[PDB]
Amino acid sequence: CSIDKIRFGEQEKIEEYLVGIAEEITKQFSANGMNVVFYTQFISEAKAALYFAKYVKLSEEGLGKIVKALLFYFPERDLDIGKRYVWLERLTKCNELPKSIISIIDDFLVLQAEKHIDQNYSEVSSNGLYSRDYGALIKHFEKNFISKRLSEITLCLTQDKQKQIDFLFKLLPLLSTNAKSHLLSFKSVENINDLMNGIRIGLIDEFTPEHEELIIEYLETRKVNYIVEKEKGIQTFSSNDYMSTFGIWYFLEEINNSKMEEFIGMDDQYDFFVDPENFDYKKFIPSWLKNYNDKLLGKIAGNKHMKHHVIEVLKERVKNSNDKRYLEILMNYFI
C-alpha cells in the first residue's frame, strides 16, 4: 500500500511517543547496567517505532531526539551501520535537515571513524558500508560541508597503519584541499579499483583516461577463470562486479575502445550491452536493466533496430502482474 498518501492526525502526542522511546533507549543502554531479560521484550517494538515515522512529521525537537540515540545508543547486535544509514534518510524523507542534525551526524561519522581504527575491525554489513554514503549524503543537503574542524582532526595522522589511508577516501568531498595534499604525500590510488567510489561521487563522468592495467588485467585473469569455471562447472553469482560496470560504460559512450567484445562466455547482461544485432533472445529476463536506473536507460532502450521483442517482454510482465512498478516503467521510457 501507499501509506504516503494517507492523512495524519493528532501529531502532537506521537512526538512524545517517539521521544519517549528515544529517552528509554538512552536510559537503558547508557550505563554499565544493561538487563537482557529486558532486552527480550519490546526491544523490537523500539525499532518498529523508529520506522513508521516516515509517513509521520517531526519538529526539530523530535528529529534531534531520535538522531541522538540512533547515532549514539543502540547496541550493535541488532544494528549495523548500514541499516542505520538506510534508516536515517527515510526519517529525512518527510522533513528538512537543520544545522543540528548536520552537527550530530558529523560527530557520529568522525567518532565512528575513530571507533574502527583497529588492527582487526572490518566494518561489515549487508550493504558494503562506506559511510562515504554519509559524506555524500550530507553533501547532498545544502551546498557544502567542508568538514569544518573535523576535517583536520581526521587529517592528523602519521606513518602508522593503512586503515585510514584509504578509509578517508570516503569523506574527501567533505574535506579541505590539504586533505588531497597530504594524500598525495603517499599512495594516491592503487586499489585495484577506485572507480567504485570516485566514479560514484566525485569523478563520475567527463573523464575516463587510459587507466591501462585495470580492465586489461581484469580480462587477462578472468579468461582463466572462464576456462576453469566452465570446464569443471560451478556457477556462484558472487555479488561483486566490474565487467558489467564497464559494459554499461561501453554503450554509455564513456568507453570508446574496440577491446570490449572479448569475453563472450557468461553474464548475458554483458552480452546484452555489447551485442546489439545478434543477442541471444532466448534469455528474456525482467532484470539487469530492469533494475532501471533512469534516463541512461532511455538511451539504452532507444534501440531503434531492437524494440519488437522488448515490447512483448513488457506484455509478459505487465500483463501477468499487478505490480505497479513494471507498467510505470513500461509507459514512458519505452515509448
Binding site: G128, S238, N291
Partner: protein, 151 residues
Amino acid sequence: MKTVIQDTADVYFKRKSDGKLVFTAEAQTASFSQAISEEKLRGGIGNKPLYILKSEKEINLTVKNAFFDLEWLAMTQGSERYEVEYRTIAYNPDTEEVYSDIYIQFPNVSPSGEFEMSLENGNALAPEIKFEALADTDTDEMAVVIEASRD
C-alpha cells in the same frame, strides 16, 4: 503416489578460523528472498549519468530443526562468523535420475533471530532460525555454487 512432490535439503554451518560444523537434517521453510528497490534521489544534474543500479542484492535464509547438535554445547560451554554450506540436489524432468548435486557456501553470514517466540502452547518447538548474509569491505564474498551433474 498421486501428487507427492517432496524433496530434501541438507544444511551445514561453520564459524571462521576453525572447521566448525553445526548442521540440520532438513529445512522445511528454506525461504530464499531477493528484494531490490531503489532510493529517492533528486539531485537533477544533466551532466551526471547515474547508472546506479544496485550492489546490495540482499539474501534471506531460514532453517528449522530440533538440532543445535550436542557437542558444541559441550565445548562451546566447556564477526564470529557463521558460514553456511548448503547441500541440495536437482533432477532432470526427462530422466528423473540421481545425477546432480548442488552446493551453496558463503564466507560472510550471520544469524538473525527474533527473541520473542514466547508462544502460548509449548509446541514441538522447531526453533526456526532466521539468517542474513553479511558483506565485508574487501570484495566478492557472496557465493560458490559447486554445480555437479557433469556428463
